[PDB]
């Protein structure tokens, strides 16, 4: 994984396309990008490795990420998760108030990304 500013607004880091104007990750398949970006820019994104947001539908718990850049530029909120014995965080229903990044999938289910370099 490598970092790079595809434009002043869009930054590609840690496998995600980061919309700096919104301070959050954006699906690399959002049609808006067809107009918001010029071909050479969208080509730069093709040549790079980006997480396919659909691979996320399959998971129920928030995902721990090793991405100093993503958490540096993305808004975060407080969310409550269960602290399991596998030392990971899980959906609620040993509680932890953890800050993380929310990303809206097509499945409409929200997936949560939290900083894995942190001990709670």
């Amino acid at each position: 994984t490598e970092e790079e500013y595809v434009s002043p607004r869009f930054l590609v880091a840690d496998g995600f396309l980061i919309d700096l104007a919104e301070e959050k990750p954006i699906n690399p398949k959002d049609p808006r990008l067809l107009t918001l970006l010029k071909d050479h820019q969208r080509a730069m994104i093709d040549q790079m490795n980006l997480v396919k947001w659909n691979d996320f539908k399959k998971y129920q718990d928030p995902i721990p990420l090793k991405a100093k850049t993503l958490f540096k530029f993305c808004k975060q909120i407080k969310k409550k998760f269960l602290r399991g014995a596998d030392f990971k965080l899980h959906t609620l229903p040993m509680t932890v108030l953890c800050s993380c990044v929310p990303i809206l999938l097509d499945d409409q289910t929200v997936q949560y990304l939290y900083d894995d370099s942190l001990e709670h």
Binding site: V6, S7, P8, L11, A21, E22, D30, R32
Partner: protein, 197 residues
């Protein structure tokens, strides 16, 4: 091929001192007021992020309560031409060795992401896209405000420029606000557009 929709929650107010020609919209619930010279944070579907404007005029109809909200468009940091900015504000601008991505990064990581840029381009606004009132201020006031900045509503403006993000010209946003709510729409818009020609 047109329909009349009711501006839910809003109410037009006519005055000079008060009365039942000056105009300004007022929202029933909280009572916020919008008129010439006020800046607002608006939802921008196409852009996928908000845009900020300065209300330029409230065109009303003498017959029916039809309102048209018009305003000057601000540019946010990411709409500034990165190479133009570097060439006009950087001390050793003659050297542009690096690839475009480098200037994108430099600008993005050193710019005040809450500093807006005035432009003379008018746009008609639809109230349902209204998010909240924007606080657009002068650098002096912006300095006193640090440590208590609400990035959702607090902005600072020191230049006006072309919609493309070039030709930066100094302005006293307070003097502009004062001016805009003084003269007549067409006049102000004509003048604002000739500062970067």
């Amino acid at each position: 091929a047109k329909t009349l929709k009711d501006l839910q929650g809003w109410e037009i107010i006519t005055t000079d001192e008060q009365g039942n020609t000056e105009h300004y919209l007022k929202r029933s619930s909280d009572g916020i007021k919008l008129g010439r010279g006020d800046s607002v944070v608006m939802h921008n579907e196409a852009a996928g992020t908000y845009s900020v404007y300065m209300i330029q005029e409230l065109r009303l109809n003498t017959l029916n309560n039809v309102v048209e909200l018009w305003a000057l468009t601000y540019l946010r940091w990411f709409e500034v031409n990165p190479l133009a900015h570097y060439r006009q504000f950087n001390p050793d601008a003659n050297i542009l060795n690096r690839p475009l991505n480098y200037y994108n990064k430099l600008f993005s990581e050193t710019a005040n992401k809450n500093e807006l840029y005035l432009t003379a381009e008018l746009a008609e606004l639809q109230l349902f896209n209204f998010i909240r009132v924007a606080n657009v201020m002068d650098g002096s006031k912006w300095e006193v405000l640090k440590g208590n900045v609400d990035p959702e509503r607090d902005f600072t403006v020191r230049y006006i420029c072309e919609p493309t993000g070039e030709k930066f010209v100094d302005i006293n946003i307070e003097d502009v606000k004062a001016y805009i709510k003084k003269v007549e729409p067409r006049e102000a818009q004509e003048y604002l557009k000739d500062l970067t020609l």
